[PDB]
């Protein structure tokens, strides 16, 4: 995340960190339940073999409530390609279930129409991650978060030099230099409704980070609730 605030104790409990063999965070993820992690499909190319870290907020220092989980099954959406960046969604089933505690809890999965009429219509969402603090820089050691305004659908299409499909959505700032960045991919985009946090997006991509006139593109979770539900049945 470029700009924004740090995640304080128990503020971003649904955050997951994808860690390669070298034990370094490359992508984010969302805790849906004890066995499942929601991530971006493209993140699966960023590392040969990977694990899932939870309850982590500072990489350099062990948090005791921090836990490493191996992946049993990787459920990738076959419709995904680097040419379109469409259907940028994957589900990970874990070998061991997550212990829910302070900093470790799942984000709610909303119902389709309600999510569309009541969540996507709120002014902002919150994006979070261990990604780059500047467009040119290294992976963050601290978990950050940033409130992002939901961006108007046609205004989003206009800002992009690429095709913004119906599975994608814009959130961010036209002038304010704060947005998600490289390494935040697969991470959560939640919308708070009455003190409860529902999962709305998966950090997908952007043209640089916090670039004026450009936004962060996320996978529209509502477009995949049945596919997500079916994934958890397998």
């Amino acid at each position: 995340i470029v700009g924004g605030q740090e995640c304080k104790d128990g503020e971003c409990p649904w955050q997951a960190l994808l860690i390669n063999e070298e034990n370094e965070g490359f992508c984010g993820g969302t805790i849906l339940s004890e066995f499942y992690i929601l991530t971006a499909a493209h993140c699966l190319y960023q590392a040969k073999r990977f694990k899932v870290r939870v309850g982590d907020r500072n990489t350099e220092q062990e948090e005791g409530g921090e836990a490493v989980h191996e992946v049993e099954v990787v459920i990738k959406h076959n419709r995904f390609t680097k040419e379109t960046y469409d259907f940028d969604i994957a589900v990970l089933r874990l070998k061991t279930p997550i212990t829910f505690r302070m900093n470790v809890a799942p984000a709610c999965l909303p119902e389709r129409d309600w999510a569309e009429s009541t969540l996507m219509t709120q002014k902002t969402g919150i994006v979070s991650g261990f990604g780059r603090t500047h467009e040119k820089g290294r992976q963050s050691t601290r978990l950050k978060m940033l409130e992002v305004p939901y961006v108007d659908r046609n205004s989003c299409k206009l800002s992009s030099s690429f095709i913004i499909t119906q599975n994608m959505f814009c959130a961010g700032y036209d002038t304010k230099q704060e947005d998600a960045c490289q390494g935040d991919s697969g991470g959560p985009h939640v919308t708070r409704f009455k003190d409860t946090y529902f999962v709305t997006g998966i950090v997908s991509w952007g043209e640089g980070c916090a670039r004026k006139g450009k936004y962060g593109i996320y996978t529209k979770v509502t477009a995949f609730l049945k596919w997500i539900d079916r994934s958890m049945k397998t």
């Binding site: 104790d9 503020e11 409990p13 339940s33 809890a105 799942p106 129409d113 009429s117 009541t118 946090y197």
Partner: protein, 52 residues
């Protein structure tokens, strides 16, 4: 106005069935007797920050 008027007083999910408001909850919550609020069945229900 139903669901469009303040989420039909539902804590979470709002639906319209036979021109009335019908509320439901995410997994890990039970609908209250008032048919509006969502009660967590156990600790750490989804979408709650762990601030305590």
């Amino acid at each position: 106005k139903l669901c469009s008027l303040d989420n039909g007083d539902c804590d979470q999910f709002c639906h319209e069935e036979q021109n009335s408001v019908v509320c439901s909850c995410a997994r890990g919550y039970t609908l209250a007797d008032n048919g509006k609020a969502c009660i967590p069945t156990g600790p750490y229900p989804c979408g709650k920050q762990t601030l305590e």
